[PDB]
Amino acid sequence: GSSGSSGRPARAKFDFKAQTLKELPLQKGDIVYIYKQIDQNWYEGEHHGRVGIFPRTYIELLSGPSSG
């Protein structure tokens, strides 16, 4: 049916305004799940029923729960 967990745990260090769909909004403190990595300085995840991309300098890859 469904899958366990998808994406990596990350916390938004700073708020981000998504101009278009491609990009996803973020808030200082809001948590997100990175499914894949766009670039060396970008990422991709979901937040508030929304999927897009955002810079890694805005989020912070949490530490702890990780099962690959």
Give 54's contacts (C-beta < 8 A, 6+ positions apart). Answer: 16, 18, 23, 24, 26, 42, 43, 44, 45
Structure obtained using: NMR
Distance of alpha carbon 9 from alpha carbon 21, whole angstroms:
21
Per the structure, the count of domains in the chain is 1
Where does 1-68 show beta strands of DSSP type E? Answer: 8-12, 31-36, 42-46, 51-55, 59-61
CATH number of the domain that residue 60 is part of: 2.30.30.40
Q: Which domain holds residue 59?
A: 1-68
Closest CA to 60 of 52, 45, 48: 45
Distance of alpha carbon 68 from alpha carbon 61, whole angstroms:
15
* Token code pair at residue 57: 């300098």
Task: Order across the sheet with 8-12: list the strands.
Answer: 51-55, 42-46, 31-36, 8-12, 59-61
